[PDB]
Symmetry: C2
Subunit: 163 residues, 2 copies
């Protein structure tokens, strides 16, 4: 059938071995923001176990208002105090510009998106931009650690980015 | 010694047995949208392997503009054609209301957020609502499959929702 069908079949085997329920608050009091990229298995990359960490993911690991919203809830309601941001090499966000993307969408749909596609040219500098977005935000101030990294999709290694 | 420090140490072990790079486009042409909840290991839940699927995650599995942006990039630039939505039982989004959350923030900061906290009272009904958000959206139309599920945090099973 479809991939959804196969993934649902995989869930049968997952459920057989499942242990729960666990408490809602992340047991390691940490939120991870990462790209949606297919090559990043965030749990395996960082040795995360079930129940430990919030994981927030979008196209390009962009600190949008949804990321701020998700961090605010994570911190204020569920007690997380560490933030890890995970960009990576060979990101799709490096491959297009915002104007061209919007133009193509409009060409085909007749409508231009209200949202910014949020492309950027340099993953390392955009970690710095992303860290700055969090640092200056009035709603996400609870963190005791805020660190950013670029994941190398060729080596599997994290490289830290300094502001 | 922070949790970030431990996870970085886990990454050293992850990288020693890493095989890559993989191609950028998800090999299974699928995007998963899921809650950021700490008890959801989306990869193992669905038996996802590296390089197969985009995974998008936020507080509540809310189809925000960021989720639409991510899915649009996912489909138009990176060839995905299936969408899975994963809400779950015992979601933090059922525990608060938007107005209370905004007031609490405004008490602390003097500043009310412009963004909606996006809370909802019922997981099954909100899968329906989330499916409708995607169905009416003019920018995410390339899917051949759009299906929504609630993950039982006590059994690890997925229960499908009829739109
Ligand atoms: Zn990426
Ligand atoms: Zn949730």
């Amino acid at each position: 059938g479809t991939v959804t069908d196969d993934y649902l079949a995989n869930n049968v085997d997952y459920a057989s071995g499942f242990k729960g329920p666990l408490p809602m608050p992340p047991s390691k009091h940490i939120a991870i923001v990462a790209c949606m990229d297919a090559r990043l298995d965030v749990y395996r990359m960082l040795g995360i176990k079930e129940g430990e960490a919030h994981v927030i993911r979008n196209a390009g690991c962009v600190v949008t208002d949804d990321v701020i919203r998700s961090l605010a809830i994570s911190q204020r309601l569920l007690g997380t105090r560490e933030i890890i941001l995970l960009h990576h090499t060979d990101c799709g966000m490096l491959t297009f510009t915002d104007d061209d993307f919007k133009r193509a969408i409009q060409d085909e749909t007749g409508i231009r998106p209200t949202w910014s596609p949020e492309s950027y040219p340099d993953a390392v500098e955009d970690v710095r931009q992303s860290l700055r977005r969090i640092e200056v935000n009035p709603f996400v101030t609870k963190h005791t650690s805020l660190r950013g990294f670029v994941f190398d999709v060729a080596t599997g290694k994290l490289n830290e980015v300094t502001p």
